[PDB]
Design a protein around this ligand. Structure first.
Ligand SMILES: Cc1cc2nc3c(=O)[nH]c(=O)nc-3n(C[C@H](O)[C@H](O)[C@H](O)COP(=O)(O)O)c2cc1C
Ligand SMILES: Cc1cc2nc3c(=O)[nH]c(=O)nc-3n(C[C@H](O)[C@H](O)[C@H](O)COP(=O)(O)O)c2cc1C
Lengths: 311, 311
């Protein structure tokens, strides 16, 4: 009963992995294809293969996780060849999502041109918010640079495109972003990427727990649900209906999923919890969401989607 | 063993209430004076009395709190007369802190002029980040507006002044702010105010939990510690040594306090936990911190202050 329509495609359920979790190699991707995830997305890629930051760069926290991966990925070509080959063996219902995170505007345009010129018929996600790349600030916090990039992208990109955004914390920022985004034929916006540059400390050792950037890393998990929900909701009420929303952040139980959908998310991505549990999480959370719906007498997501009530 | 020197004043310990919690009326303040807090601060005031937002506007959460108080306060004159009367009857070792949060630059300058002209010899905290006032974006997220205001304030304000800042999530933002602040004879910066505009949902009722701003409110408590610690540490390494730091955010145990001190905070403010526990919290947390220090063989905060180790 979780059938979903997103970007003109039908998915068995709205669950996907969040980019960067369990999607580094073809082996990881095949495991997601074999799981009950309704769809899956590749690790954000760059033109050149990258090793990422020094270890340790990821730590499981009681309330979530902190990481500073530094974009380790097997390179743009590796992922493109994989998706193109999978396009031929139609053994999946729905398109695959392809994430790109170029280190500069030039690199993102180059990758998008290649995607546009290829036979790829899936969905592309432009990551404008990686908080863990030393020397590179989050492009999506610079409204002007963001508007400039999107203008150049839409002069040639005609395929489905969505943007992964960092969290915003001021209503006026939502107004400004929504206005910039509403002018483009975007397929979706995905909120949110990690809460950037947080710090976790081991009081006994009196030190940080991750090696890169003096311990500052992206925060995810339970810590960020309040912000994730707010971002999904704030955008749901300001974006033109043509642009759908993928909600990412703090999803660990069917209840968390239910809350994102109530705010207005259509697809849902699980990061930290999937990293901790493995692909079996999809089976568990699908069962949990269905139980919630059963108890409430709901037979489809359309019964409550975007219907969060004010007081 | 928690003796502290801050703004050239000596305090029995570094603990104080965070502005807005247990400090609305003279009765609240007197209870703080009678508790074991090393110092205390008043509720942010405006020139005129304010009722604040409709109820419910504050909700305790398992991992913190969410609120949209709307600056309810008894007015600038009420707090000033109270602090002035207290100065006469010298029954306190250490100045009292006075928070102001005018709805416009003009209102802030007017209150500051009044403080400058009065006999007030305590410390003033200028709130540049109230995220719960409908229609007003956080001034501190506007670097240019913030620089202008401080430029004007320092052309006449000669008494001790500190600034309460909203959390920042991009290292470049820390660089820009540190450069703006370093040019002024500021006494301190207080990081951080609530994580702005989060959302909490009651899944059973399928609605938000607070009435104002459609349920969007400031987040505090365990949810924000990683961000709080990061802000304190990021500023500690960029600000000129003359500007000290007050760390606020997610403090509820001695260990949380220890982590803030390890990052570089000198004074510590407790918000959410004090709202939940009452002034008796000071007695508990002081014992917990001393217990940690005893186990490690530390006899004063100077032994580990700002000594967080990188990997
Ligand atoms: C180990 C790790 C790596 C990540 N890598 C990326 C990445 O390559 N691309 C991206 O857009 N987001 C990345 N994310 C961030 C997320 O996709 C997601 O937005 C985030 O973790 C918030 O969700 P969560 O609370 O479920 O973790 C990563 C998160 C983690 C935990
Ligand atoms: C009920 C409430 C009212 C608040 N009022 C103010 C206020 O008037 N001025 C201010 O600077 N901060 C205000 N804050 C924010 C805090 O002083 C503090 O920055 C925040 O709660 C983060 O700390 P915590 O994690 O200990 O709550 C308020 C917080 C709460 C819980």
């Amino acid at each position: 009963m979780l059938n979903t329509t997103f970007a003109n495609a039908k998915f068995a359920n709205p669950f996907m992995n969040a980019s960067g979790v369990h999607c580094m190699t073809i082996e990881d991707l095949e495991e997601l294809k074999a799981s009950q995830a309704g769809a899956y997305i590749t690790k954000s890629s760059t033109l050149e293969k990258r090793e990422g930051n020094p270890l340790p760069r990821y730590v499981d926290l009681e309330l979530g996780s902190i990481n500073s991966m530094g974009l380790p990925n097997l390179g743009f070509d590796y992922y493109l060849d994989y998706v193109l080959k999978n396009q031929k063996e139609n053994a999946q219902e729905g398109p695959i999502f392809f994430s790109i995170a170029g280190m500069s505007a030039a690199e993102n345009i180059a990758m998008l041109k290649k995607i546009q010129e290829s036979d790829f018929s899936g969905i592309t996600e432009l990551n404008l918010s990686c908080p863990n790349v030393p020397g590179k600030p989050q492009l999506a916090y610079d409204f002007e640079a963001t508007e400039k990039l999107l203008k150049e992208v839409f002069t040639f990109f005609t395929k489905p495109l969505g943007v992964k955004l960092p969290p915003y914390f001021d209503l006026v920022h939502f107004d400004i972003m929504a206005e910039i985004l509403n002018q483009f034929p975007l397929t979706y916006v995905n909120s949110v990427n990690s809460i950037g540059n947080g710090l976790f400390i081991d009081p006994e050792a009196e030190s940080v727990v991750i090696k890169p950037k003096d311990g500052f890393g992206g925060i995810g998990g339970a810590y960020i649900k309040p912000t994730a929900l707010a971002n999904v909701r704030a955008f749901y009420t300001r974006l033109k209906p043509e642009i759908q929303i993928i909600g990412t952040g703090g999803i660990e139980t069917g209840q968390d999923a239910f809350e994102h959908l109530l705010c207005g998310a259509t697809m849902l991505q699980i990061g930290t919890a999937l990293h901790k549990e493995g692909p079996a999480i999809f089976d568990r959370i699908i069962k949990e969401l269905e139980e919630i719906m059963n108890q409430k007498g709901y037979q489809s997501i359309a019964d409550f989607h975007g219907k969060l009530k004010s007081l």
